[PDB]
Design a protein around this ligand. Structure first.
Ligand SMILES: C[C@@H]1O[C@@H](O[C@H]2[C@H](O[C@H]3[C@H](O)[C@@H](O)[C@@H](O)O[C@@H]3CO)O[C@H](CO)[C@H](O)[C@@H]2O)[C@@H](O)[C@H](O)[C@@H]1O
Ligand SMILES: C[C@@H]1O[C@@H](O[C@H]2[C@H](O[C@H]3[C@H](O)[C@@H](O)[C@@H](O)O[C@@H]3CO)O[C@H](CO)[C@H](O)[C@@H]2O)[C@@H](O)[C@H](O)[C@@H]1O
Ligand code: NA
Ligand code: NA
Lengths: 288, 288
């Protein structure tokens, strides 16, 4: 059975770093070359890496018990979390460069509570299982990311969703992060799937793969994966090819702009064409 | 290419009526025969019906503009909704038998607001695009279901998530509901995938298919669908067959329980449903 990607239009799919619809395709700003996202990471043969879960019902969520001073984290199903397992429990938010506002609810209790998370202080150590409670009263909670705002520290800094948070006790501590993703060359640019994120600005959250691609690849467990997969981005009504793309084994897409992808409509489908060599040269998007 | 279901354990998947992890398999109470859920509805050949979306990022969400008295609904991306399209916009919550508490956020503004929804009054008419604001101030909002509680009317009623809400101006108005789903006979009962829902009780939300099955079937667009699919529920560790099930073309699963203390609700949730073969609608299952 040949390799496949989901036969679904991009605009019907979700971001893999928060539970938000995809609204556009984009590229990184020119002061960003590599990224190191911890959610939305899955290889073409179905290996989840970082904190990535199979399902969106786990994405950008936390679970833990507050004692009024700290929240001691668990996995989302209540299973214990230990530092050797990763930088944070599976599905923990990976949005650097902002304050988080997490909606906290409880099994067996009424009400919801907004939990305000600054990810910069020394008390923010999810790799060791603990984050500051910041006024959340004692109890067990499940929280989902709801909206974001500029970081509290350093003052005057802006929202920057190309970053990841400081999961460890310091910037030097080893937290078992998923490795960085780098542009591969050949004039190719990394492709990101973008979602609008609520909050006091025009926030756009990038990810490397839609969440439904992750569950697809994890199910498919491709027995054979070549050096790179040649894709066409196809308009499903006319069947027209809107542009050539490559997908790489580590789980990201590229194209050659002109341009691009920022201008492409979001109602297309990515279709596997064939395995090509890593250095296969793409026609610039739109061309011809 | 033969028919497939996702090769993923149930415990890694999501409910299709709210963005919640699957925690158990269940059957309905004795006084529930048919169900008429509007979300989590997809045929085996990939036809979405009711208000079902492809992606969990649309499930149990609302979008609209409040004027202080009513909320005028749209689709989640802002596109207009009209009564001919269905009982409510795509993804609108379909949990009857409870009050809803929806977390409302805004693009371009700070803060979240809890929106309390009684689905019984004459002002709750999402089929006509309008629901009461109940104190939500003027503005455009996106909301997601956060937790539930017992219905405000009739006073003292129980939480009954086997029901759907009154989408129309009365119980008699035709709102283009997806049709009911019935137990097919031959000793078989409907099988449901259950999630724990936050709120002041031990609430268990049933659905007919996990959301990741819906996106899989919608992508697969199976060209051949038989009278019924014979399935095995398989332990992925040992490969052992834990029980026989049937999947029917309209998009639901069944089994024959081996008594009351013994049935699908006692199965572990770490198994995978695997397609075996197409069988006749009358194929007699071995009890679980
Ligand atoms: C509205 C609050 O948002 C979060 O606090 C953020 C903080 O908000 C401040 C507003 O910007 C300011 O207009 C005034 O209202 O004070 C607010 C509280 O300090 O702004 C900083 C950046 O300077 C961060 O973005 C904060 O996260 C939230 O934590 C609060 O609970 C409020 O909901
Ligand atoms: C906590 C509130 O929950 C929702 O209101 C529900 C209402 O809650 C009442 C509590 O049960 C009662 O102990 C006391 O606190 O008054 C509450 C408010 O009336 O109960 C009815 C059922 O009788 C419904 O379940 C309501 O949804 C919510 O709407 C409120 O804003 C509060 O969060
Ligand atoms: Na830290
Ligand atoms: Na109504």
């Amino acid at each position: 059975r040949p390799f496949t990607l989901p036969n679904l239009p991009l605009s019907s799919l979700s971001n893999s770093r928060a539970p938000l619809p995809i609204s556009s395709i984009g590229i990184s700003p020119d002061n960003v070359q590599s990224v190191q996202f911890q959610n939305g990471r899955c290889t073409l043969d179905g290996r989840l890496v970082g904190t990535t879960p199979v399902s969106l019902s786990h994405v950008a969520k936390i679970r833990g018990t507050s004692n009024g001073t700290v929240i001691n984290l668990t996995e989302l199903d209540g299973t214990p979390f230990h530092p050797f397992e990763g930088p944070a429990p599976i599905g923990f938010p990976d949005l650097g460069g902002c304050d988080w506002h997490i909606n906290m609810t409880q099994f067996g209790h009424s009400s919801q509570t907004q939990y305000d998370v600054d990810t910069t202080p020394d008390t923010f150590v999810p790799h060791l299982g603990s984050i500051q409670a910041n006024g959340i009263g004692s109890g067990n909670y499940v929280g989902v990311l709801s909206w974001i705002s500029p970081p509290s520290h350093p003052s005057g800094s802006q929202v920057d969703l190309w970053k990841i948070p400081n999961y460890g006790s310091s910037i030097t501590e080893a937290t078992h992060l998923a490795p960085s993703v780098y542009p591969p060359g050949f004039g190719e640019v990394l492709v990101f799937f973008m979602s609008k994120m609520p909050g006091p600005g025009a926030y756009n959250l990038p990810c490397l793969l839609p969440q439904e691609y992750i569950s697809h690849l994890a199910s498919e467990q491709a027995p054979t994966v070549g050096e790179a997969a040649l894709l066409h981005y196809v308009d499903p009504d006319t069947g027209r090819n809107l542009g050539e793309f490559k997908a790489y084994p580590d789980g990201f897409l590229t194209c050659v702009p002109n341009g691009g992808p920022q201008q492409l409509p979001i109602n297309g489908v990515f279709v596997f064409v064939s395995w090509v060599s890593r250095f296969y040269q793409l026609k610039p998007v739109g061309t011809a």
